[PDB]
Amino acid sequence: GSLTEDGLSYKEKFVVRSYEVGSNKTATVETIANLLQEVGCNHAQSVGFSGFATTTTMRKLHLIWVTARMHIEIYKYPAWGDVVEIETWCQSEGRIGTRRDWILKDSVTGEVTGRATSKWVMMNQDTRRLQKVSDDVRDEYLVFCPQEPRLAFPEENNRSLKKIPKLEDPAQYSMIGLKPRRADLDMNQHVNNVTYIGWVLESIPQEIVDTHELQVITLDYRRECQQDDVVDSLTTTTSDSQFLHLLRLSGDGQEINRGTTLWRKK
Template identity: 40%
Template sequence: MVAPITTAASMCAFHNVVLATQNYGIKKGIKQGLGVKRGSCGGLQMKANAQNHNGDDKISKVVSKSSIRQNFTIRSYEVDANGIASIETLMNYFQSSIIDHCNTLGIHVDAAGSSKEMIKRNLVWVYSEMQVWIYRYPKWDDVVEVETWLSSEGKNAARFNWIVRDFKTNQMLNRASSVCVLMNKLTRRLSKIPVEVRREFESYLKNSRIIIEGDDKKIPKLDDTSADYICLDLKPRWSDIDINFHVNNAKYVSWILESIPESILMNYELSSLTLKFKRECKRDSKLQSLAEVCSDNNNNNNNNNVEYNHMLRSEDGVEILRGRTEWRLKPTNNFDIFNHDPEASIKDL
């Protein structure tokens, strides 16, 4: 009962992320340091980047009936100013791998990841929430192996799971998980999973331990008085829109990062990300990105990490997304300094 493609606020798209021109508003009393435009270069890689170093140009290894591994080479236009893969790039790899996964299983029919029974009913998968943990970022020209599998999540949802490893060393670099639900493309309303759709997917669902436990910590709703930083006049560009005229989910990450102070972007790196999608974002949407500092290295934080709450809203105040980001100081040697298990695999979950 799964095959991904969208966020509850957007359908996933096969487009590069392009940032619009912004005007920034900063709350009084907060140190200046936001009003610098930050470009991002995360692009979706399909067949050209899904390189298999064992001959197959798409799928590197079918681990089991429900688990597939796929290789990607980090390109120069997919890295940020630090020379490491951007978070948008990783988000796009997740999307690409799950689509190819479903295609390999024989249940993926169209570019939106819909099965035959879903197409009959005008249904698409949308993300309702997503979590990403990042232990180490791959660098330019690194080859990463993305393992994907599907699992059940209650009666009317599904979970997509990912582990990203260094292809050469097999070290775990990232892990991510998302909860997806069905939405009717015509009514724009969420739908229960029909029995016919469930039958298409149920034999491929892996009954395994959840790779990332749900984030039960409440993310507060922000407003002009509670937000420490506000980024104004965000608007999707044509290249952010997919075939269903919705915004690529990686774009949401770009938007919430626009409200992070430049001093944090220069000295810290993103270590975890939680997103909870509330509404769709369409071509004519005009958005604002709000951020609240909920912990920093000057506020009872012994590990020097920084944490922010986020909210995207439309200009008329309609809430689009809530999120939380955690940041750690950039290491001088970004290799093998985090406590991750190089042998971790789906078989261990």
């Protein structure tokens, strides 16, 4: 991987692995989401940021960036053995937080095969308290971001910024008692953000997966699932097929995530 000529974005190529593909012999959305995370980490490392991407003031004040929203749209899933090229960049969104965007391309054709956008908010890693971005922190990372806006989803009033409602009981479908194993944790022993995508998808009926391709997934992150927590995944059809999703703790029913998926007939 490498920073582009201007040093304001980063590119990396990936050959899709045998274990990374599903029943259609193309990369799963969880493989795509792991590749997005990987290119994001390699971009942070290439410009001086460390197991977290933090500025100097963030380390001093015990602050971390945490995902608030992930939105991904795939037009073509790369096949096993194919080379996919991913470009990523960060943008400041004033004191609300930061945004990390991605464009996916087929390496042979140069054609855009997917795009993603993610909203990140600042939080104290000890008290878990959300904060707005201080001027000192904002000034420490702005020189690594494009100054003029660069958006993976430019269109005014597009899918990436739509408000998601809370699924009401009874859910049409459910997958209960989901628990993370050690492979679901990252190097800091936190549940990987991609695991939540998998858990959301667990309550989609197998018949939908067998006859449809996932086109869009928007996921809100409200609370983290601890290593010893148990989760219930709920799905209701709102419609192409569209679904409304909810992940909550199995016991008290505390919300951890909410989302929507859009699927196209194969």
